[PDB]
């Protein structure tokens, strides 16, 4: 069947649109070549949908049918818990889009009457209706990338009563079957540096190790109705409670499997087929999805000793070389797998038989040295789009923050350290907001986090050597070099000049801006302050950062206040 269908009603913007960055003198100060930074719109909508819209053709296997039945039997050991109302409202972020049904966010983390009432009765809607689609609301993302344009990614989610309901019935399943199924594969359980651990031990753990990436083609496309039957049929392995076991079904056949698309305008748009990218179920059903394709398709392939690293669509697979000719035949036959599976190549796979080649999750694996000179494993990126969404969110104030997630996630890299925290640190001592709250996400869920706790949060993801990396691989220092002349970024001693001024400035307020100078920003200078594990990083509570991804899944991870 078609991935989708329409009717020729324009995917609209609910108001103006921007596209270019403004020419402002702090993004400016960072970024100076701001005709490269643009930000994706609705007026490229329709070159999506051209790239989209397609048959699927799927063929399943014995080996297919194998995979799931093992997946199930691992399944059958959850036991998920249903989430009061109160406890899903206070998993809605404070700035999610508002209900066409007269309430807002707000309204749902304040547990109003008018908001509670509503959730109560899409709830019971799901307990008695089996089969009225749910409609379903399509846009154009708006998201900043630097020029080589691409066309707006199109974003689908059904109205917010709907979305507190799929955390009732589904926000444990998707926060603990994963693991459970999966195992070591899922990707989501892994802070940075347990991913780097995992994917260096993985590596080092083959006699000649061979890896790749496999790069699917709109990937939520290509899922079909059967996959989202087969994604429940994994569910329907837990205890549940009966009112989670319907909510569950009606919730495949009336929006996971596909449904009605309406624009802003409340115009009818089309028809889907295939996995929307705003449910609660996208993250863990494309991980699932993805992990049952590839793991059947190895076997298919005749891959030998094949240890998947799973998020989402994005795959990884590390594996026991038979040699380079018989490799490169076995990746072909592994790809006609997936391809009957419905899952084509976007990227032609390649074998690697280097780790630091390999790009998975857009990072890949590279080398510094600690102050003993000792050799520490981090994982970094091509800082083109961190940089570009860091100049954006300087011009303009944006709901989500990259630069401070980027900052925590990527913390022991040369560009995280020298650009992105020097700039931020900067314009935020002179604006007194070091201390103010921001919201950033962490694997798709949303987090509210002061700048000033940065050093106790990366010493407790990363470790005390994140602030004493030194000795970067040339191929990094290069690529970041080749990054800042493209973008017209200053060069590295400039960063160097503002950190240490901002460094003195942080030191002589003393508290948490003094730890932030001292920790943060020791790499600056010759004189080296001690670094001592913070006494606040053993107290931080960081359950949740590193258990499930939500992206689109409509998270909230901070917590709520009391009334
Ligand atoms: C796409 S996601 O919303 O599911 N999570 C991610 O963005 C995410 C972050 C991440 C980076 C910055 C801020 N915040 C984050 O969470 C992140 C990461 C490392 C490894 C994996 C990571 N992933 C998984 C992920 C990334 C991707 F490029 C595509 C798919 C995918 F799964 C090394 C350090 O940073």
Redesign the pocket.
Same mark, same amino acid.
């Given at each position: 069947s078609m991935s989708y269908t329409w009717t020729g009603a324009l995917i609209t913007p609910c108001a103006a649109e921007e596209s270019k960055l403004p020419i402002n003198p702090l993004s400016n100060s960072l970024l100076r070549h701001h005709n490269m930074v643009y930000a994706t719109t609705s007026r490229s909508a329709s070159l999506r949908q051209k790239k989209v819209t397609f048959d699927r053709l799927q063929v399943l296997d014995d080996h297919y049918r194998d995979v799931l039945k093992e997946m199930k039997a691992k399944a059958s050991t959850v036991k998920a818990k249903l989430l009061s109302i109160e406890e899903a409202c206070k998993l809605t972020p404070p700035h999610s889009a508002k209900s066409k049904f007269g309430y807002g966010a707000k309204d749902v983390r304040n547990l109003s009457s008018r908001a509670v009432n509503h959730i109560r009765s899409v709830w019971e809607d799901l307990l008695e209706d089996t089969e009225t689609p749910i409609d379903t609301t399509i846009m154009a993302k708006s998201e900043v990338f630097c020029v080589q344009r691409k066309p707006a990614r199109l974003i689908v989610f059904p109205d917010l009563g709907v979305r507190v309901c799929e955390k009732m019935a589904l926000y444990d399943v998707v926060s603990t079957l994963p693991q459970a199924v999966m195992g070591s594969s899922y @990707?989501?359980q892994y802070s940075?540096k347990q *991913?780097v651990e995992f994917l260096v031990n993985t590596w080092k753990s083959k006699k000649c190790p061979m890896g790749f990436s496999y790069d699917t083609r709109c990937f939520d496309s290509t899922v079909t109705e059967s996959d989202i039957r087969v994604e429940e049929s994994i569910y329907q392995c837990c205890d549940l409670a009966p009112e989670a076991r319907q909510a569950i079904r009606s919730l495949t056949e009336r929006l996971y499997i596909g449904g009605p698309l309406t624009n802003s305008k409340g115009q009818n748009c089309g028809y889907r087929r295939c996995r929307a990218s705003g449910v609660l179920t996208t %993250?863990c059903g494309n991980t699932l999805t993805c992990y049952l394709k590839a793991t059947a398709a190895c076997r298919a392939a005749k891959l030998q000793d094949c240890t998947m690293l799973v998020? #989402? =669509? =994005?795959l990884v697979v590390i594996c026991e070389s038979a040699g380079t000719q018989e490799d490169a035949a076995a990746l072909r036959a592994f790809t006609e797998a997936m391809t009957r599976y419905s899952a084509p190549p976007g990227d032609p796979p390649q074998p690697e038989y280097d780790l630091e080649l390999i790009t998975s999750? %857009?990072?890949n694996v590279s080398v510094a040295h600690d102050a003993s000179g000792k050799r520490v494993y981090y994982?970094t *990126?091509d800082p083109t789009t961190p940089l570009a969404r860091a100049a954006w969110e300087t011009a303009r104030h944006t709901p989500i923050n %990259?630069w401070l @997630?980027?900052i &925590?996630? !990527?913390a022991p890299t040369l560009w995280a350290r020298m650009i992105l925290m020097t700039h931020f640190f900067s314009i935020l001592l002179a604006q007194e907001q070091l201390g103010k709250a921001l919201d950033?996400? &962490? !694997? @798709?869920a949303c987090y509210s986090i002061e700048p000033l706790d940065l050093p106790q949060i990366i010493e407790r993801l990363h470790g005390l050597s994140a602030f004493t990396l030194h000795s970067y691989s040339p191929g990094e220092i290069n690529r970041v070099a080749s990054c800042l002349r493209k973008l017209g970024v200053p060069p590295l001693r400039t960063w160097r000049h503002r950190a240490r001024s901002v460094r003195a400035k942080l030191l002589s307020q003393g508290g948490r801006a003094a730890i932030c100078g001292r920790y943060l920003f020791n790499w600056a200078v010759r004189t080296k302050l001690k670094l001592t594990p913070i006494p606040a990083a053993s107290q931080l509570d960081l359950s949740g950062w590193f258990v499930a #991804? !939500? %992206?689109g899944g409509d998270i909230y991870h901070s917590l709520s206040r009391a009334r």
């Open positions: @990707g989501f940075p *991913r %993250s998020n #989402g =669509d =994005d999750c %857009s990072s994982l *990126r %990259s @997630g980027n &925590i996630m !990527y950033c996400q &962490i !694997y @798709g #991804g !939500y %992206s």
